[PDB]
Amino acid sequence: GSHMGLFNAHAVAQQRADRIATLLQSFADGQLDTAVGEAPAPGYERLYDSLRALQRQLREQRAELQQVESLEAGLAEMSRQHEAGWIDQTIPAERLEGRAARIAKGVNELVAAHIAVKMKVVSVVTAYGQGNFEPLMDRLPGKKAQITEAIDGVRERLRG
């Protein structure tokens, strides 16, 4: 209606924009818990809906990266334990979740299979060492077949 009304409309659009600016900034640096308020007026509702969606997306996305950060430490800790021979240590999948949690069990399961082969070897070789030669090393696939043939090799030497 007047020159003052125009100036005022602009001063308001400018501060509404400044608030959205402060908000996006508070996202750029982890402040993703404190919810955004409601839109200043009809024209900014869709915009504000997206801000909320964004905050939500950034929040979850940060949790997952945090996960992968816990995964690396756990793997590193397990690696250290195993180099010292403490092979019963595993990555704690219990406090992880989603993708990270699955990778952790994957690692524990992969090693468990390798350890299981050794458990069996330490076993029959222990029986071979203390007399009895009845036990036979399990048959293994691919390249692990060498373990089974090598154990058979010393199985004859003894038995005959």
Helix (H, G, I), strand (E, B) or coil at 145: helix
Burial of 28 (0-12, 13-18, 19+ CB in 10 A): exposed
| Positions 74 through 103 that interact with a second copy (CB under 8 A) | 75-76, 78-79, 82-88, 99-100, 102-103
Closest contact distance (angstroms) between CB of 92 and a second copy is: 15
Supply 107's token pair: 């690692």
Judge whether 132 and 107 are in contact, CB under 8 Å: no
Q: For the chain, what's the residue count? A: 160
For CA atoms 76, 77, 78, 79, give the dihedral sign: positive
Cβ contact 67:100 at 8 Å: yes
Of the pair 33, 131, the CB lying nearest a second copy is at 131
Which one of residues 94, 131, 134, 159 is an interface residue with a second copy (CB under 8 A)?
Answer: 131
Write each residue from 36 to 65 as x if it is in contact with a second copy (CB under 8 A), else as -, in one continuous string.
Answer: -------xx-xx--xx-xx--xx--xx-xx
Among 37, 66, 136, 150, binds a second copy (CB under 8 A): 150
- Which of residues 5, 33, 34, 94 is near a second copy by CB under 8 A? 5
Q: Of 53 and 65, which CB lies nearer to Cl ion in the complex structure?
A: 53
Asked if residue 111 binds a second copy (CB under 8 A), the reply is yes
From the CB of 103, what's the least distance to a second copy, in Å?
5
**Cα–Cα distance between 157 and 39 in angstroms, integer?**
85
